[PDB]
């Protein structure tokens, strides 16, 4: 009846934690904006270990993988743009004339460029979009680069492709990634079907506003997610059941000219326009959009009561803030997105919705100031043919709720894919009473303590053990090693370093848990047990150090005599 403390190493118990994840991809490109050489190849085997008898609490709005992804996305963009020509001298005043077709959208500007060579000051002509040039004086023929007054504009290297490539996040040693497989998971709350993965599915890092593109579709129906949901100040992420095809075109061809800035470096701009001037535009099928709004309104009605639902467009302002944005083909498109959110549902202008679009070359990306990118002109017709997969809606009084296209920041897109993933820290050390004194990873996490220790080996085998990303990974590896050694030193001072299950000779105190072994090894899982005695963990460990050992080491010294 007298019970003794036993230490188990490799216990399938975890705590919520924030860490740095590894970057994996399908090796299959070169000169990609996402710098694929900084990511490792993925393992063709997806792993995917289903956790039986495990229900976990997921919260997409507190998911650290979203902040990590946003940081990595920004870092990769800055790394990709760093080795490119900076447009230091292109701050000179530009003498512009309108191009007569888009009436005044494209301006033909003459300007005088100085160089580092200083052989001569050269006069050049170039075409720019209305959104890139800002009138600097009352004179209606003086203009300057939009970003000149605040920063030096960095030109993107034409060799850099902006095509999104799937990115997988993989758990570092010492951590695990859980995935919620509930078909109707709402992004917040318990999930009854949870699996553990090594790497997430591929995430396309598509940069867009208001409408989510490509990504992934909902399995059963349109699902509308938010945090408080009653609060107006939350981003509403709508994941669609079926995608809507959007065909965006930039019909103008143009030509590309190089104006040398210095040795080995040049500014790439548009020369002469070939063909007619035609407005860039996007075509969305009207009937499919009808069905998308019908489904969204139905799902909104279920949570906001049977009120009138109205979709309004954004207010006037800078096109980078209030208009839809995307970058297919390596060109940067902004579209009005106002022929889509202009309807009242309560309770035919053709069969295709054609949205006007505008092209901008100087982009202040990632909601930052002081840095800007100049996108070199592409020389052909730009086709998109992308899949609209989910919306970002915001909410703003006579019995009507007003919804508008909108969003927070780019993290709202990552949540759209990352809502089902969670990162957890594994705590392999557990302590339990026993009678005697001195499947897959987490497969038994939901099982009772009995018959879950027979898989401790798995947690012990797996889980443990000049670029900036390289140094950050180095720090992560050092921290993982330090963590493993902290566990090994705890086993050392307890005399347990030589085996996974270490039996001690310190009695179990009924004040810690006044329960029979059947109440402990059966009935409870390891997580419930570790929670039950959490408040005494620091006390229990002290006795393991002070009992047996120290007293036992002293006893060991005198056995020779």
């Amino acid at each position, epitope marked *: 009846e007298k019970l003794w403390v036993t230490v188990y190493y490799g216990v399938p118990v975890w705590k919520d934690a924030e860490t740095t994840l590894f970057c994996a991809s399908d090796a299959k490109e070169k000169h990609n904006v996402w710098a694929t050489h900084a990511c490792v190849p993925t393992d063709p085997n997806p792993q995917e270990v289903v956790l039986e008898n495990v229900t976990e609490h997921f919260n997409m709005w507190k998911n650290n993988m979203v902040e990590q992804m946003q940081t990595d996305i920004i870092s990769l963009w800055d790394q990709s743009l760093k080795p490119c020509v900076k447009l230091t001298p292109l701050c000179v005043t530009l003498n512009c004339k309108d191009v007569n077709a888009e009436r005044g959208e494209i301006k033909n500007c003459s300007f005088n460029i100085t160089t580092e060579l200083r052989d001569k000051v050269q006069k050049v002509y170039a075409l720019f979009y209305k959104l890139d040039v800002v009138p600097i004086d009352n004179n209606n023929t003086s203009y300057r680069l939009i970003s000149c007054d605040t920063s030096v504009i960095t030109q993107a290297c034409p060799k850099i492709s902006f095509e999104p490539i799937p990115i997988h996040y993989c758990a570092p040693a010492g951590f695990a990634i859980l995935k919620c497989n509930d078909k109707t998971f709402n992004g917040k709350g318990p999930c009854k079907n949870v699996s553990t993965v090594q790497c997430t599915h591929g995430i396309r890092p598509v940069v867009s506003t208001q409408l989510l593109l490509n990504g992934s579709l909902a399995e059963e129906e349109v699902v509308i997610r938010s945090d408080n949901f009653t609060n107006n*100040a939350k981003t509403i992420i709508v994941q669609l059941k079926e995608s809507v095809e959007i065909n965006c075109t930039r019909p103008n061809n143009y030509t590309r000219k190089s104006i040398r800035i210095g040795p080995g470096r040049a500014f790439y701009t548009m020369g002469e326009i070939i063909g007619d001037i035609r407005q860039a535009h996007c075509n969305i099928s009207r009937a499919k959009w009808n069905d998308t709004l019908k489904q969204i309104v139905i799902k909104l009605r279920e949570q906001f009561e049977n009120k009138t639902i109205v979709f309004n467009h954004s207010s*006037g302002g800078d096109p980078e*803030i209030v208009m839809h944005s995307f970058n297919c083909g390596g060109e940067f498109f902004y579209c009005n997105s106002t022929q889509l959110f202009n309807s009242t549902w309560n309770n035919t202008e053709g069969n295709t919705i054609t949205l006007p679009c505008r092209i901008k070359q100087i982009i202040n990306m990632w909601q930052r100031v002081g840095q800007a990118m100049y996108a070199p002109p592409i020389r052909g017709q730009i086709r998109c043919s992308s899949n609209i997969t989910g919306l970002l809606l915001t909410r703003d009084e006579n019995g009507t709720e007003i919804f508008r296209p909108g*969003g927070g920041d780019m993290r709202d897109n990552w949540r759209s894919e990352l809502y089902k993933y969670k990162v957890v820290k594994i705590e392999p050390l557990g302590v339990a009473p026993t009678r005697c004194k001195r499947r897959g990873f987490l497969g038994a996490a939901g099982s009772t303590m009995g018959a879950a220790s027979m898989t401790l080996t798995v947690q012990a085998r797996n889980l443990l053990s000049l670029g900036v990303w390289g140094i950050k990974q180095l720090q992560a590896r050092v921290l993982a090693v330090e963590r493993y050694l902290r566990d090994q030193q705890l086993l050392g001072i307890w005399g347990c370093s030589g085996k996974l299950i270490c039996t001690t000779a310190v009695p179990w105190n009924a004040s810690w848990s006044n329960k029979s072994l059947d109440r402990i090894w059966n009935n409870m899982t390891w997580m419930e047990w570790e929670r039950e005695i959490d408040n005494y963990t620091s006390e229990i460990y002290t006795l393991i150090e002070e009992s047996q050992n120290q007293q036992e080491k002293n006893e060991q010294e005198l056995l020779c005599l």
Partner: antibody
Framework: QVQLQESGPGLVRPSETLSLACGVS????????WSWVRQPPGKGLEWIGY???????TNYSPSLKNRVTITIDTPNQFSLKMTSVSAADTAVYFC?????????????????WGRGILVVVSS | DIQMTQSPSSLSASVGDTVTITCRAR??????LNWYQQKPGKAPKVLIY???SRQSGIPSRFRGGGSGTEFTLTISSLQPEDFGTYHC?????????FGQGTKVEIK
């Protein structure tokens, strides 16, 4: 420490021009964004506009761009001229210095404020 | 123009507690949100620059942060000197609009 002081008429008619000056005491109109911001009673604040001390370049809020002109007069004084001032424009007007150079404490925040002049539109 | 809101519109707390004021943007601004403190009858002074960067001379009791559209100002160990109206301003894009302001009464 740079100090600013608003000066101008307290009462303006519904149809005439509003003219407010902002003097600089321990300083001058340096190469910062010198700006005006409006605060109606009981409301928050709204931007009126700014003039860059480097040149004569100005910028104004689009909703007021066609009525407000901000200029620099003396090296130590700048002013806001707002035409066709309506009853809705009664407010406390503040002038200030907006920092934009990153290497200072403020990177982008109205750093120097005046004391504020309360302007009432009435007959 | 980016529209700004703030919550709660009316706040009160006793001396020594910790309070939070949340400033909300219709559109994301990165970290470019400033915080100001206005005393009744006086012009405001800035407390926080780029969302989290505190002005010299302001004690460490004033903390803040956030990104995108939802930002917070946290005032630890609330003092009688903290009575006043707090404001938030976006510097990301012109016009640099302000929220309606939160009145903080000290009890």
């Amino acid at each position: 420490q740079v100090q600013l002081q608003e000066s101008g008429p307290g009462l303006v008619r519904p149809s005439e021009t509003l003219s407010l000056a902002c003097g600089v005491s321990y300083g001058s109109v340096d190469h910062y964004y010198w700006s005006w911001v409006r605060q109606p009673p009981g409301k928050g604040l709204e931007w009126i506009g700014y003039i860059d001390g480097y040149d004569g370049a100005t910028n104004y809020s689009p909703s007021l761009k066609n009525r407000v002109t901000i200029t620099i007069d003396t090296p130590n004084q700048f002013s806001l001229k707002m035409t066709s001032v309506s009853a809705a424009d009664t407010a406390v007007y503040f002038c200030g210095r907006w920092n934009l150079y990153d290497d200072d404490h403020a990177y982008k925040s109205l750093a120097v404020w005046g004391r504020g002049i309360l302007v009432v539109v009435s007959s | 123009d980016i529209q700004m809101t703030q919550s709660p519109s009316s706040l009160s707390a006793s001396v020594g507690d910790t309070v939070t004021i949340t400033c909300r943007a219709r559109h994301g601004v990165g970290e470019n949100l400033n915080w100001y403190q206005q005393k009744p009858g006086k012009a405001p002074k800035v407390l926080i620059y780029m969302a989290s960067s505190r002005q010299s001379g302001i004690p460490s009791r004033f903390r803040g942060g956030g990104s995108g559209t939802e930002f917070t100002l946290t005032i630890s160990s609330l003092q009688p000197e903290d009575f006043g109206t707090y404001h938030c301003q976006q510097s990301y894009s012109y016009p640099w609009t302000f929220g309606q302001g939160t009145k903080v009464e000290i009890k």
